[PDB]
Amino acid sequence: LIST
Amino acid sequence: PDVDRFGRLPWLWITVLVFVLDQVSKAFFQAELSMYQQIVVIPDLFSWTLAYNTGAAFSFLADSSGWQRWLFALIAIVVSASLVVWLKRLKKGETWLAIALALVLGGALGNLYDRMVLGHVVDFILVHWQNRWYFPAFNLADSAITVGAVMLALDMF
Ligand SMILES: CCCCCCCC/C=C\CCCCCCCC(=O)OC[C@H](O)CO
Ligand SMILES: CCCCCCCC/C=C\CCCCCCCC(=O)OC[C@H](O)CO
Ligand SMILES: CCCCCCCC/C=C\CCCCCCCC(=O)OC[C@H](O)CO
Ligand SMILES: CCCCCCCC/C=C\CCCCCCCC(=O)OC[C@H](O)CO
Ligand SMILES: CCCCCCCC/C=C\CCCCCCCC(=O)OC[C@H](O)CO
Ligand SMILES: CCCCCCCC/C=C\CCCCCCCC(=O)OC[C@H](O)CO
């Protein structure tokens, strides 16, 4: 989901 | 009335709003900054930047580079589907969980859009404390994802  | 004939779907407009806000956020700092150039706002705590995270945090799982663009995009695709039916199942008055699902969904779709259009993910918020440490850059999508996780984690109390 997030950037990483 | 119209409010009930759509169900809990009108909550998607918060998802639509976050996606739009995050896409203009990226489009500004892209065409405004250079890669890793930082515009200092609070000299020792905060600045604007233009880092492109290719998802290189999980590089330890393979001796290739590029599969994060797909493994993570697929994650967002499937996760979004289970979070769409989850919002449909909710009821009136569960406005805490309706906001939380819309927040998490909106952010993940804004980063899924990145990985499907441009191989990386645009990030533009470098929170730091002097040269002591530098938190990784993120965007409005990460901000929406992180808030929605908090709202769900404080719904099990
Ligand atoms: C590159 C930027 C792309 C972003 C541009 C995307 C435009 C999509 C917006 C609206 C159409 C689909 C509506 C999606 C929201 C559904 C809301 C809903 O389900 O409720 C139905 C009814 O409108 C009760 O409000
Ligand atoms: C990343 C930060 C971006 C910030 C994004 C804003 C955060 C949302 C705040 C207020 C929602 C505005 C009100 C919109 C409510 C519409 C949804 C709705 O009314 O759903 C009714 C449903 O039918 C009942 O069962
Ligand atoms: C939180 C809900 C609010 C809505 C979400 C928006 C907030 C996101 C932050 C910034 C967006 C872009 C704002 C741009 C501000 C920086 C402009 C700038 O510093 O430009 C420097 C110029 O290049 C001269 O050197
Ligand atoms: C909790 C809700 C949070 C709401 C957050 C959304 C508000 C607007 C977005 C950022 C404000 C930060 C302001 C920083 C922009 C000023 C940049 C500037 O000072 O100009 C650039 C200059 O060249 C270098 O000093
Ligand atoms: C409210 C708006 C909601 C929008 C939500 C964002 C949608 C994400 C964008 C496309 C996904 C569709 C997948 C279609 C297949 C894309 C093919 C592709 O990934 O192209 C790769 C590249 O062009 C070759 O190197
Ligand atoms: C009604 C819903 C309101 C919606 C809330 C609007 C107010 C935003 C408040 C604070 C900003 C939150 C910023 C969260 C920062 C998360 C940083 C993060 O996700 O981690 C980055 C990671 O290191 C790399 O991927």
Numbering used by the authors:
A (entry chain E): 201 to 204
B (entry chain A): 2 to 158
Task: Give excerpts from the publication.
As expected, the structures of the labeled and unlabeled protein are virtually identical with a root-mean-square deviation of 0.36 Å for backbone Cα atoms. This supports the view that the 13C/15N-labeled LspA preparation used in the ssNMR experiments was properly folded and enzymatically active. The complex used in this study was prepared by incubating detergent-solubilized 13C/15N-labeled LspA with a 10-fold molar excess of globomycin for 30 min on ice. Reconstitution of the complex into the cubic mesophase was carried out by the traditional twin-syringe mixing method. These structural changes likely involve stabilization of the LspA backbone in a more rigid conformation.
The larger, 169-residue LspA is a key enzyme in the lipoprotein processing pathway of Pseudomonas aeruginosa. LspA functions to release the signal peptide from prolipoproteins and is inhibited by the natural macrocyclic antibiotics, globomycin, and myxovirescin. It is a promising target for the development of drugs that combat antimicrobial resistance. In meso crystal structures of LspA in complex with globomycin and myxovirescin reveal that the enzyme consists of four transmembrane helices with periplasmic extensions that include an amphiphilic β sheet region, referred to as the β cradle, and a flexible loop with a short periplasmic helix.
